[PDB]
């Protein structure tokens, strides 16, 4: 049986504040800029539609140098940091981005037509953009976040997949890495392995995987380390209703309609797809720049940062403004020439993480050691190399950022005032 | 006279948690894919616009093996499960689907016209899609849910129905089965038997029946077993205003207008029909992933699961995103060709049902037996074959899912915290 | 260590009211009107999209002439004014402005296209306008406000910047001056040094810098003098989705799409940019014409107006109505002639600042003098020339506006009623 | 010094109810219909966009005949009516009007253009209408309401105004009169004297002055008689973005753009103007048909109706529906002919004012007489001709409408129930 951390974790009266200075990220909104002949990334892909997963490193409270050490017995017990307050600061002005594809697979406008559309020739793709669905979310835990998305399942050993056959689906759980893309209105799926077309969605998710937090799985988790707090806010509506060019993969059963003739003799593509639109963005609806007090967790792990680690996942599309900047090739002629200006696109993201940590002590009794051992053996082994080297996240080092004077910080002041004593 | 179950059903202090692992449904959004020559379903129709009716099977508390059995007398009484808490977990990201018809009966755009429309020739149908009306609902009871819809009533034995004559309507009560369709903006009617046209609405409801819960009837129900709790949320607005091609079934009385001339000599179809649109979908408006505490029922049956059965009906169009996946027939040519790619459509649904059950006891006195016998004789017969074999629902077996440690589950923790003791 | 002003600043019982008569500003909405041959400004640029930074001058409480002076010892202590109440009155009717450019860089409409767009020739610029994003904000402190914006960073000494090369970005902190522009939907950046084009955005921000308050930095500020109170309200949504003419600065990696042919042979500009739109403006959402009681500040400076100064920064786009007024060149002909009328544009802004100040005393002990000295040496030096002469703000002199009869003023009545005694 | 009326005005226990029967106003929405040769008004201009200023006449409580007169000494004191409750009843169904101009100065659509607009010829005016900005407001006081608007200021005696020169602006305070127009989305200005064009705005405000309540001034007012209570609700958004035909009054500084060529050689009008739109009207947002309890005024005059007068200003555009009614010239031909029907426009407004008055007494001591004398000498002079004969307003006589039985009226019952005793 699993038990609340309040059972075996003792709460001291010491609190520390810690914070990143001000994280900054600048890059291209749709894809990374690199040397053609090369593969080294010259400019990274930075979009408001990516997940930001921060791997927060905390100084080991056991190795730490406190002014007083009488509050506990380093022989019978050990120390762990407990996250009690978080403030995810965001810094650019609110705004909405926009993503498209120069060759998006869009046959005709099916929202309203005055006459039957022509006939699909070869390549009827159009240069089309859209404003993605709005999403605001923040996940906090001591384990990396887990997402779900649809990918190409493994086929059953029988009927030989005929080329062009529809690929099988399979919900795939994955670790949400920093830089991954958020569902933008086309659901959470692996577009690379599920759309050979390469033109079904805008460039920025075109050959990526849009993942969605698997909230159900993470909360089901027995110990609840992956996430002990979260805030989610997503909205979306249908801006346009389109048709997909290509060839019928699956024909419309004729018991569903009466054959046409002349123009309506040939059925138009009934492979419709809508264009998303996350409406207006607003201050009143902001989730960030507000402190979160992680006092009572719904999981058994009540904010204990085992491993002196802490994960903060964020997605904020309410500041997705992309800015176009163009430089003149020549500063002579007083006559505009599209030829004389090179147009580019860049997007900037501004973060500022702040935390309030409460020192905790664990008397290493037998039972406790048995439990903690089962739960996560590494805990004890580390007490008196990176297990997730495969994954990549925004590394954040706070070992030199802890301060006992909450007084001197904004999150700290808020905390004292909030907790009174 | 009927009486509250609180009268004859005793509440014990035992509570169990039960939950489905994670139900998953993948299929085509508009129609089932099957072998043309055959009739076996290869891929099922799975749309966010269908009703999901779960038939929950519970272990017979009388046959069940409790650690302690002193809490009741198996001689004078019997045991029944009472539903006290439900959590309908949903798992895909929020999003809106879209449905159409390659040959929708849409003459002209009547929302605004600059000149009198031409003249209906033969087949003026257009390839048109729309975003259905938004609907979120959840019905819980120990009897299957009942719906209403308009169908073709039986004609009066007189005036012989001239071919093409308008068919008579009749509100028809039916049992809502898993897979049925929800009103999408065209009301709750049987389109197959009321629209020979086969082109008045999109393919997905085109030859189906859109049913609406008959809330009035169910609540009037004397014992109130069909539904002891519900949540409904529906919204819709007019996106477009169209005309219907075809021939006047009923002419416009000439006392309602002044005859035209030339172009306006012939009256245009005044058989208007609007295109629905369930606006934006939002987190804040979610009905699911929230626990429902069924403490006081408005009906006489206060959540007692007679027959160790339990029905959970759901409709959620806030995650109706359909994903198009296309496979290339050839991976050679570096030049797009519509024909090289087979386009398809698939839609996935993710559920996770969780419940908290309270054991109850009934002392089988004379009066009690008379009452329960009148109410539903099978109750007693079963105490010391499927009556709804005709109907089909998502069968859910929980006989091996009950657990006394609410502590170990999310809905369980919530329940304990909520009910304090 | 920094400490709250409540520590060393004593609160007296004297309160004074002070207010501007009624500030008025009239000018051209997009640019200043001046003599061509000259440079003197004939008509200034006055837009609802500019920041209004008021430099409030207060009478030195030490030089002031109070009826009674027994309340303190002019030998051991000094006096400072503390801001306790503010009312930013606004006076024109609510309404929305509009800004554009006669030669805006807008290739084609990418929101929905029926056929592949033509081909960029020379200068495809269009005369386009838009309604900027709505913004309401009010910053108050005893130091000028600080903003952030993206500008052209300094290049690394290596690869000689090829002409037309994309310029490097750099977040630049600046002092927000009166007349500066607010992000309007294109983010906070320096369009002059980042867009050689001179046609990427409307005229009014076209050769300016749109700055955003750097709330993060100001609140981190140790003493918190720059801002001890603020209100922000911003909203925006995508009205249109466009394309940018010009030449590819950075090409679309070919691994993101399948080469086209014929018309789709050449990739259309995928340098998309959206048109902003701050929706409807409303009374219910007003921030102004409401009193703000600055009782508990989140910073250490609790509204103390060191230097007898006070800064009030405002931005209100909910009254951005521009009014066109045209004069006839001739009052004869009774036939309209566009040539007979000269069309112009003017915008008016109306303010009315009101404050409630509380007198305070500081006993100049050793420690106090050491602290205040470290904090801002000028404090003491001035006690028993302008350091921001470089910057420009709406100068407001209140030295002759203080009144001890709060009773006689609207903000004063409100204050008494609010604070009871 | 000014003092609250609570200081010198004594409150009795007598309360009277008074109300208009049901005021009704019918006329043409845009302009008055009169005899061409004549000047007499045959049909007045009645629009939902006009201010309604009611001059309420109350019976002199001193001349009044009360059943009992022991409650006061007619020798030492005098009597005044105090307004304690108001109910502005409105009676037509909610709806939105619409106003246009057959020759509105609208060059081209600048919201989105596919090619550079042609060239302004002679008179490019279009027949255009719009739905004005929504406004609901109610001002009450014992003095007429005061408004502000921009008009043509007096020129400086220097540079001789060249014909066509832009006219100088000047905020002008005026008395708001019954029938005056409300800002409709083009701000509060005098279009007659600021727009020679006569085609910048719809007919209904085209040669009128749109005034806005000068709330700032009125509340600053020392005694606060002009308004001791108010409710304002206004909203507006940009429907369309247009261009103004005419000739450049002020040219676009060339440092703001790069000269074009060919078509873009000549700059298109950058004198943009938006089309307003007060969105949807709703019951939930109604301000009227609700009682207002004027118990505590923010001004010093707490609802005392000096001069036995009372002003109720109202503006309600939530019932601006105009109804078109056309009569046939001939009732013969069964063929429609536009020439056979004369089309007209009419708009109706329905009011019903109700008040609850509290009798008050003032002992005429020395000090009191000095104060009241300074405040408004006429008070005393009238005690034991019209000063605003020049202005106009809906005259309302209530001298015969006072009733001591509040019980018998709806506002009366509400009052009793609200005030308990």
């Amino acid at each position: 049986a699993v038990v609340s951390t309040d059972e075996y974790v003792a709460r001291t009266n010491i609190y520390y504040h810690a914070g990143t200075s001000r994280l900054l990220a600048v890059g291209h909104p749709y894809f990374p800029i690199k040397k053609p002949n090369n593969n080294k990334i010259l400019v990274p892909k930075v979009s408001g539609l990516q997940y930001r997963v921060f791997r927060i490193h905390l100084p080991d409270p056991n190795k730490f140098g406190f002014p007083d050490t009488s509050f506990y017995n380093p022989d019978t017990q050990r120390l762990v940091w407990a996250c009690v307050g978080v403030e995810v600061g965001r810094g650019q002005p609110l705004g909405v981005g926009i993503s498209g594809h120069p060759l998006l697979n869009k046959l005709d406008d099916t929202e309203n037509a005055s006459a039957y559309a022509a006939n699909a020739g070869v390549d009827n793709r159009e240069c089309i953009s859209m404003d993605y669905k709005q999403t605001q979310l923040c996940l906090i835990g001591c384990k990396p976040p887990i997402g779900e998305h649809w990918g190409k399942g493994s086929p059953c050993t029988q009927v030989a997949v005929q080329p062009g056959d529809c690929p099988p689906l399979e919900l795939i759980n994955t670790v949400i890495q920093d830089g991954d893309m958020v569902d933008t209105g086309f659901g959470a799926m692996d577009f690379t392995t599920l759309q050979a077309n390469k033109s079904e969605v805008p460039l920025d998710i075109c050959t990526s995987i849009c993942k969605y937090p698997d909230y159900i799985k993470m909360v089901s988790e027995p110990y609840g380390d992956s996430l002990f707090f979260y805030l989610r806010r997503e909205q979306m509506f249908v801006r346009h209703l389109f048709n997909r060019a290509g060839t019928v993969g699956e024909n419309v059963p004729d018991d569903l309609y009466i054959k046409g003739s002349g123009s309506t003799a040939n059925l138009a593509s009934s492979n419709y797809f809508p264009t998303p639109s996350g409406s207006m963005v607003t201050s009143d609806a902001q989730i960030f720049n507000k402190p979160y007090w992680l006092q009572r967790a719904q999981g058994h792990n009540n904010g204990i940062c085992w491993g002196n680690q802490l994960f903060v996942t964020v997605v904020d599309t309410t500041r997705s403004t992309n800015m176009s900047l163009c430089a003149a090739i020549s500063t002579s002629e007083t006559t505009y020439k599209n030829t004389n200006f090179k147009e580019y696109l860049r997007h900037g993201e501004e973060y500022d993480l702040q935390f309030i940590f409460q020192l905790c002590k664990i008397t290493l009794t037998a039972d406790v050691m048995t439990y903690i051992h089962s739960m996560n053996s590494t805990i004890l082994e580390d007490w008196n190399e990176d297990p997730l080297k495969k994954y990549t996240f925004w590394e954040v080092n706070l070992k030199e950022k802890f301060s006992a004077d909450l007084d001197q910080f904004p999150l700290g002041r808020k905390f004292l005032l909030q907790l009174g004593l």
Side-chain angles (χ1 to χ4, degrees), chain A:
Chain A
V2 177
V3 290
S4 166
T5 53
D6 306 348
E7 289 260 51
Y8 55 97
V9 184
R11 300 270 169 168
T12 85
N13 214 173
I14 331 212
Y15 295 87
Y16 279 66
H17 165 287
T20 74
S21 60
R22 167 220 274 174
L23 313 186
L24 218 48
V26 191
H28 187 287
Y30 308 150
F31 48 71
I33 274 67
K34 56 178 66 182
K35 196 122 177 147
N37 60 307
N38 195 246
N39 63 316
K40 175 185 291 206
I41 358 83
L42 196 57
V43 184
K45 183 217 259 200
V46 186
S47 144
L49 285 126
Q50 325 182 82
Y51 278 88
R52 281 277 152 260
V53 189
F54 307 102
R55 222 270 205 64
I56 317 300
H57 298 293
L58 313 188
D60 183 337
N62 297 293
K63 243 80 160 295
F64 200 65
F66 301 87
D68 181 65
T69 42
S70 68
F71 66 82
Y72 92 113
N73 191 321
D75 297 36
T76 38
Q77 49 213 200
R78 286 282 170 270
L79 302 187
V80 200
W81 283 122
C83 185
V84 187
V86 173
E87 240 252 46
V88 176
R90 299 289 284 120
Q92 291 291 299
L94 265 52
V96 187
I98 185 183
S99 304
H101 195 319
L103 298 162
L104 183 82
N105 184 16
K106 175 265 177 174
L107 188 54
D108 20 75
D109 192 325
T110 71
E111 174 182 359
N112 179 358
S114 44
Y116 219 65
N119 245 162
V122 196
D123 205 331
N124 302 83
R125 305 179 298 180
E126 320 284 333
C127 171
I128 298 188
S129 56
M130 59 204 80
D131 56 290
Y132 284 160
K133 111 170 183 179
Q134 186 170 163
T135 298
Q136 285 189 74
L137 70 88
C138 176
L139 318 166
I140 315 275
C142 62
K143 290 292 191 180
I146 296 149
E148 55 168 38
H149 73 279
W150 296 94
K152 189 217 280 187
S154 68
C156 264
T157 314
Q158 295 138 9
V159 202
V161 189
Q162 299 288 307
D165 273 15
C166 182
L169 284 324
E170 182 225 319
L171 194 61
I172 306 166
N173 266 313
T174 156
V175 170
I176 301 177
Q177 295 185 77
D178 182 72
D180 270 322
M181 305 299 277
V182 200
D183 62 300
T184 57
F186 294 84
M189 58 187 265
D190 182 346
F191 304 84
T192 311
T193 78
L194 258 21
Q195 305 185 328
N197 191 285
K198 249 174 185 179
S199 308
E200 306 283 284
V201 302
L203 292 324
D204 64 342
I205 61 163
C206 159
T207 62
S208 293
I209 302 97
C210 283
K211 316 206 271 195
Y212 186 64
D214 192 330
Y215 299 95
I216 294 78
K217 187 192 187 69
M218 289 191 272
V219 180
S220 293
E221 169 168 339
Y223 294 110
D225 303 303
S226 56
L227 89 74
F228 35 67
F229 166 78
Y230 76 81
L231 282 182
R232 62 150 108 83
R233 216 121 305 174
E234 50 191 291
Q235 60 172 49
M236 175 253 259
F237 81 83
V238 176
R239 164 90 81 147
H240 283 105
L241 299 80
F242 298 153
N243 234 191
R244 289 285 194 201
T247 60
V248 184
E250 278 159 349
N251 265 310
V252 183
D254 41 19
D255 62 294
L256 298 188
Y257 72 102
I258 295 163
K259 280 282 204 278
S261 71
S263 50
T264 62
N266 295 309
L267 248 43
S269 164
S270 53
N271 271 172
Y272 316 99
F273 81 94
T275 285
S277 174
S279 198
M280 176 171 70
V281 281
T282 148
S283 310
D284 302 313
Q286 283 297 285
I287 269 169
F288 320 99
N289 291 310
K290 289 165 62 185
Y292 312 138
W293 305 123
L294 319 178
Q295 36 178 63
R296 254 115 278 176
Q298 36 54 268
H300 279 136
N301 179 352
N302 208 321
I304 306 300
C305 303
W306 302 119
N308 312 302
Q309 263 189 175
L310 194 280
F311 277 90
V312 171
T313 311
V314 173
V315 171
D316 181 24
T317 71
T318 71
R319 288 177 175 80
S320 45
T321 297
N322 297 138
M323 53 201 114
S324 60
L325 43 162
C326 80
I329 191 107
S330 166
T331 51
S332 319
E333 349 81 301
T334 57
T335 304
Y336 187 83
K337 299 187 284 177
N338 306 103
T339 117
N340 180 47
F341 308 94
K342 273 171 168 333
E343 292 284 319
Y344 305 79
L345 283 180
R346 286 288 134 74
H347 178 278
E349 219 76 62
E350 186 183 326
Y351 286 77
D352 172 81
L353 313 181
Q354 311 162 60
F355 310 74
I356 299 301
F357 294 97
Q358 189 180 335
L359 189 57
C360 292
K361 44 157 74 171
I362 318 317
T363 312
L364 299 171
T365 77
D367 323 80
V368 179
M369 286 205 263
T370 319
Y371 187 97
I372 287 57
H373 176 268
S374 305
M375 188 175 100
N376 180 181
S377 286
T378 74
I379 300 187
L380 303 165
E381 314 185 310
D382 295 308
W383 271 340
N384 197 136
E385 154 217 64
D386 166 25
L388 319 80
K389 188 207 71 68
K390 302 221 163 193
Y391 315 102
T392 74
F393 346 75
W394 193 315
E395 296 304 328
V396 172
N397 202 298
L398 297 187
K399 300 159 186 170
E400 259 109 73
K401 300 300 202 73
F402 277 47
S403 173
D405 314 310
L406 315 183
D407 200 4
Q408 303 310 81
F409 308 82
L411 210 214
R413 287 165 232 136
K414 289 183 183 176
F415 175 71
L416 293 168
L417 181 51
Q418 182 264 339
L419 236 298
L421 50 146

